[PDB]
Design a protein around this ligand. Structure first.
Ligand SMILES: CC[N+](CC)(CC)Cc1ccccc1
Ligand SMILES: CC[N+](CC)(CC)Cc1ccccc1
Ligand SMILES: [Mg+2]
Ligand SMILES: [Mg+2]
Ligand SMILES: [Mg+2]
Ligand SMILES: [Mg+2]
Ligand SMILES: [Mg+2]
Ligand SMILES: [Mg+2]
Lengths: 317, 313
């Protein structure tokens, strides 16, 4: 293995609905990260709100926490920070998916104002609770790695500007799929996979695995679609984001037939990623390339594993 | 301990959750298979060439992988027996249905507990070869030979006796389990391990077994669609076309749907096994679980790379 020994492997085969070819693990610092997440949940969502109730269900963990599983490759000190930072983004998602698109985009621009290299969390005392919590965690994530902080801030601003900026329905997979990689947060998550390992890829290194990265991004968000369809199908939204409804429209099929199609699409993207990795590895590969491969496979395989059994996608209104 | 475990994750198109192995007796079995291919098919025929292509094996032989759990003496017997059935399939698929059924009936005349192979030297080369190996297979296990013959007669009577097109999966899937030979192959998974299941033991895992049978034949459909879609037949058997007709989609969409159906059947089977294992389970039940998973996993592994299914340009 090319990444530090910070995780224990999970036996996915013991879970009947876990279908991924990729491995799953769980961080050795799981308890400590769960504590940080429950604390930030208290502060970044208000009592009595829907987003507070969803945050609690999201960290009801019969098989493990989503972050300690999916980001198990991260150094423990970094894992607590990136988990709480993405957790604030996930609370924001639950808040803004329920808003009309225009109001939602204002809220994204509001939260984006926290994204400063010189962020002072006190200057957001009269803001909403997500601004307050994000500024505090972001402050720490800058201070832990100031060399990477500009890139992280650029990544976070690009996310809030683009992940939810299209309002329509989609009618073809070939247009939905590129957008859903952004919408599902993969460019943020995969950034933090590298950041949590205190490593980067060069421009040339990234370009050499970019098609692989896109296939994995496809697997990650479409697998969430597959598992979150039941809870999403009756959600009241002006912009459903789920491959099942896209395929229903593109091919004029029932929900059930479209969900079978989606699962096949996912499995073929897992195979495409595996082919693309095989081709890359016919040329010499740096240690950094090898550890991105290993960690992103644990991210995608762990995500499948956690989604398979997460109360979030089964316990709803 | 008659097999080595394969690393399926190294094959990008291998998607099954189930394991794959290969027999320690692979070379012996392949020699016997090449031997029977010369005897049970005629030089320069279509079916001879398809049999040679079937055993080109960059990753291993169909039989040494899927039936890797069998004692090596039985493996060479059941592999050559099924192989004659496979040649027979290649021959009869391309015949009109009535002619095919007559050929199935002619072949079944060999299936008797007291077969005398010399009684068939004037018959066609598949009757000849099947009688020879059937004799040996009866004799290696006379106690099991009645059930074996019953199963083989049931197979030739029901695997290809429907002639129409299928327009719903609800009907296609139970028929495809038989049409793909799964009741023959799964019997030889038990026979090859010199064991059996009692009627109640089988009753307790029957839904599991149906789910695995669905996986097996539908996985073949997925990987063999590319060649079968242009084959001249009056009775195509492939879930892709069934789904195209039932849901009115393109072939590409139906193939995606079929892959999804397969993976959900693999999950269903794992759910059913987990349920069964909440009650006490005999050694035999545990043996079948482990060997049938190697069969289904190995079959996905072999199909995913077999030259048999390749199409070019
Ligand atoms: C990091 C992405 N997200 C988006 C809801 C948190 C903001 C959760 C998620 C993870 C994996 C797949 C889909 C969504
Ligand atoms: C064992 C069944 N068969 C039928 C062509 C030999 C008679 C090969 C086969 C194996 C698995 C799936 C489909 C076909
Ligand atoms: Mg969302
Ligand atoms: Mg959501
Ligand atoms: Mg979702
Ligand atoms: Mg056939
Ligand atoms: Mg055939
Ligand atoms: Mg076929």
């Amino acid at each position: 293995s090319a990444i530090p020994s910070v995780f224990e492997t999970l036996q996915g085969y013991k879970v009947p609905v876990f279908f991924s070819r990729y491995p799953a693990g769980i961080s050795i610092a799981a308890q400590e990260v769960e504590d940080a997440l429950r604390k930030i949940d208290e502060e970044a969502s208000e009592e009595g709100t829907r987003e507070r109730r969803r945050a609690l269900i999201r960290h009801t963990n019969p098989y493990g926490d989503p972050f300690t599983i999916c980001h198990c490759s991260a150094f423990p000190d970094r894992l607590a920070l990136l988990s709480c930072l993405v957790e604030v983004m996930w609370i924001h998602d639950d808040v803004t998916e329920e808003m009309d698109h225009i109001s939602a985009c204002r809220e994204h621009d509001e939260l984006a104002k926290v994204l400063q290299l010189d962020i002072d969390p006190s200057k957001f005392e009269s803001g909403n609770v997500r601004q307050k919590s994000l500024a505090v965690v972001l402050r720490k994530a800058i201070d832990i790695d100031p060399k990477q902080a500009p890139a992280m801030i650029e990544m976070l601003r690009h996310y809030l500007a683009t992940f939810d900026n299209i309002g329509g329905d989609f009618t073809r997979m070939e247009e939905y799929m590129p957008y859903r990689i952004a919408n599902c947060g993969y460019w943020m998550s995969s950034y933090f996979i590298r950041w949590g390992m205190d490593m980067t890829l060069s421009e040339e290194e990234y370009a050499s695995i970019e098609q692989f990265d896109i296939a994995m991004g496809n697997v990650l968000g479409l697998t969430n679609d597959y598992f979150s369809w039941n809870i999403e199908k009756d959600q009241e939204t002006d912009r459903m984001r789920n491959g099942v409804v896209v395929l229903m429209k593109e091919h004029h099929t029932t929900a059930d037939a479209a969900k079978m199609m989606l699962l096949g699409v996912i499995v073929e993207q897992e195979s495409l990623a595996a082919k693309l990795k095989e081709e890359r590895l016919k040329k010499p590969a740096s240690k950094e390339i090898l550890q991105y491969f290993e960690a992103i496979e644990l991210y995608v395989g762990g995500s499948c594993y956690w989604h398979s059994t997460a109360p979030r996608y089964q316990v709803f209104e």
